[PDB]
Amino acid sequence: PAHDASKVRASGPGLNASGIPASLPVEFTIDARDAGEGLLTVQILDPEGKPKKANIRDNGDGTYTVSYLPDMSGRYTITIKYGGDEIPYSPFRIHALPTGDASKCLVTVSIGGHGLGACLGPRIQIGQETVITVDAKAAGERKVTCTVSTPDGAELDVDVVENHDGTFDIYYTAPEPGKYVITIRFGGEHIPNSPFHVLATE
Amino acid sequence: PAHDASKVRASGPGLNASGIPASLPVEFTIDARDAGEGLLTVQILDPEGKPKKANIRDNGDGTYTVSYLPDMSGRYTITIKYGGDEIPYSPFRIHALPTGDASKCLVTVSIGGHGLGACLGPRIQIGQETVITVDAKAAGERKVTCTVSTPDGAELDVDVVENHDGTFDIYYTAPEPGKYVITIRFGGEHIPNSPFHVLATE
């Protein structure tokens, strides 16, 4: 069977034209029920112009659930193709909006049970876990995100434990030697002392 | 049973009022052979008014060898008494002069086998050694020194190990609870983020 990308429809929170909350995971739906047979592709550039992971779930019914994490405030450009052809209204230009005051976050770092206060590196040890606790109690209802730029150039969404008392815990261990950037945002915006530049060594 | 402090003679590199290099230990000699019987005392005030230890070796022949460490830039005041009476030209005012660039020194902290980067404090555990390594390779020809202000009210010279590759290791264990100030200088001047304020707890 053929495909007809002009019949593909997009909807849902992750494409909201009025903007989306930065720091919150979001979903949107792609409906290709009238579009024939083809692969759905989704490519996202983040506000710093870098690629961002788009998770595509095929619902087995002609529809797809697409999820991404807008960690940083700004414009996300989402290019969507079906069967190799760009769908109507792609590329989508989605504005992740900040709320709250990231600058009210307080950060404490711990290594091996030793508290460092708001301080990390410059040098850290491969294989040694760092624990970064962010106190967002005063900052607003949004979340803390942690994005790590590794020496090979990848970008990692580090899991952030939400304790539900306005605090967040970040556990990260550097596995390879070289330079890392640990970017910690609240509601889309850097918290104080973010980003942490560090060098991981034996 | 008497003494005459006016007959005591003093001389030597640690009394060089033209100037001495900060960060380097120095000695001087006291000749009390013509001064009768009495106890020799030497008080040293650093340029901020804090007492510094003067080590007095009684040579058993009416002479004494005295040493001290001028860790900080500025004028030291050296009060010398024999039999409780001040000797001539006391107090001696000895200017320790800075050299080099302490801003080029780099700090690494280690506690309990864990490297903590440049991060010292806010809290440390009583009886747990801290190792502070200062990389002074780019700072010039002088030495790193360390003084600790103890909750005692006392002001201690902490011995610094010179590795002769441009780095220096400071080992320090807080013996008692309370607030400590750890001052680290190079060639008389604070390295970056000195002084370090830490609280020792159980």
CATH topology of domain B102-200: Immunoglobulin-like (2.60.40)
Q: List CB contacts of A40: < 8 A, sequence separation 6 or more.
A: A30, A32, A56, A58, A64, A80, A81, A82
Q: List CB contacts of A11: < 8 A, sequence separation 6 or more.
A: A28, A29, A31
Size of interface A-B (CB pairs under 8 A): 41
Q: Which two tokens stand for residue B148?
A: 């600790």
Q: Are the Cβ atoms of A112 and B112 closer than 8 angstroms?
A: yes
Q: Does domain A5-97 have CATH number 2.60.40.60?
A: no
Q: Does this chain's domain B5-97 share its CATH topology with B102-200?
A: yes
3-state class (DSSP) for residue A194: coil
Of B108, B112, B119, the CB nearest to A116: B119
Q: Cβ contacts (< 8 Å) between B119 and chain A: which residues? A: 109, 116-117, 119-121
Cβ A114 vs Cβ B114: under 8 Å: yes
Whether residue A19 lies within 8 A of chain B, CB to CB, comes out as no
Distance (Å) from the alpha carbon of A176 to chain B's nearest alpha carbon:
17
Q: Are the Cβ atoms of A123 and B117 closer than 8 angstroms?
A: yes
Q: Cβ contacts (< 8 Å) between A125 and chain B: which residues? A: 114-115
Q: Are the Cβ atoms of A122 and B122 closer than 8 angstroms?
A: no
Q: Are the Cβ atoms of A111 and B108 closer than 8 angstroms?
A: no
d(CA A4, CA A8): 8
Interface test with chain A among B119, B120, B124, B197, by most A beta carbons within 10 Å: B119
Q: Is the peptide bond before B195 cis (omega within 30 degrees of 0)?
A: yes
Question: Which residue in B has a C-alpha nearest to residue A125's C-alpha?
Answer: B115
Q: Which residues of B45-77 are buried (b: 16+ CB within 10 A; e: fewer)?
A: ebbeeeebebeeeeeeebebebbbbbbbbeebb
d(CA A28, CA A21): 14
Q: For this experimental structure, what is the resolution in angstroms? A: 1.6
Return the sign of the alpha-carbon dihedral for residues B2, B7, B13, B19: positive
Of B108, B112, B118, the CB nearest to A114: B112
SS3 per-residue string spanning chain B: CCECHHHCEEECHHHCCCCEECCCCEEEEEECCCCECCCEEEEEECCCCCEECCEEEECCCCEEEEEECCCCCEEEEEEEEECCEECCCCCEEEEEECCCCHHHCEEEEEECCEECCCCCCCEEECCCCEEEEEECCCCCCCCEEEEEECCCCCEEEECEEECCCCEEEEEECCCCCEEEEEEEEECCEECCCCCEEEEEEC
Q: How was this structure determined?
A: X-ray
Closest by CA to B30, choosing from B48, B54, B47, is: B54
d(CA B71, CA B20): 11
Whether residue A127 lies within 8 A of chain B, CB to CB, comes out as no
Domain ranges across chain A: 5-97, 102-200
Tell me the pairing of strands A129-135 and A167-173: antiparallel
Q: Are the Cβ atoms of B118 and A117 closer than 8 angstroms?
A: no
Whether residue B175 lies within 8 A of chain A, CB to CB, comes out as no
